[PDB]
């Protein structure tokens, strides 16, 4: 189907200062941070938008920290609590009254194995849309 207008080209989640003291036990995680992706002006014939997610994983499957803090994974979840690791998709129905589509997502840092170390956190998740 024809494409909508992508109205969120770039978004940034700043997790702030996390503490290794509280990222010691396996499975410890930061609070969730909200991020939304907006599509507008969906053309006639387009009833669904599918987002596809990419970026480098680490051994845990979650997105690799490209910064210096060790044992830090980055996790993206959808509105159903599903993890959107690299290669995942999420499909939303267009609201015909506004010809728009909204993707409410959340992000957190996670330590799968525990024992996070001090350092930076940096990652980028890319999103590419198909239309049907």
């Amino acid at each position: 189907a024809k494409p909508c207008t992508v109205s969120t080209t770039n978004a940034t989640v700043d997790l702030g200062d996390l503490y290794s003291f509280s990222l010691m036990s396996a499975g410890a995680a930061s609070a969730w941070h909200d991020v939304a992706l907006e599509l507008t002006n969906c053309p006639v014939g387009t009833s669904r938008v599918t987002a596809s997610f990419s970026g480098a994983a680490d051994s845990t499957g979650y997105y690799k920290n490209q910064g210096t803090a060790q044992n830090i994974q980055l996790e993206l979840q959808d509105d159903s609590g599903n993890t959107l690791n690299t290669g995942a998709t999420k499909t939303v129905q267009v609201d015909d009254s506004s010809q728009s589509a909204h993707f409410p997502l959340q992000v957190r840092a996670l330590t799968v194995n525990g024992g996070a170390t001090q350092g930076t956190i940096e990652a980028v998740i890319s999103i590419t849309y198909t239309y049907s």
């Binding site: 992508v6 969120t8 080209t9 770039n10 978004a11 940034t12 989640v13 700043d14 997790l15 702030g16 200062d17 996390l18 503490y19 290794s20 990222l23 930061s30 991020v35 992706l37 997105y63 803090a69 830090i72 980055l74 993206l76 997502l105 992000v107 840092a109 996070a116 170390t117 001090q118 350092g119 930076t120 956190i121 940096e122 990652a123 980028v124 998740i125 890319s126 999103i127 849309y129």
Partner: peptide, 10 residues
């Protein structure tokens, strides 16, 4: 679209 994630572990 791109989602950039930043932070520090202290």
């Amino acid at each position: 679209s791109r989602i950039r994630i930043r932070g520090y572990v202290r």
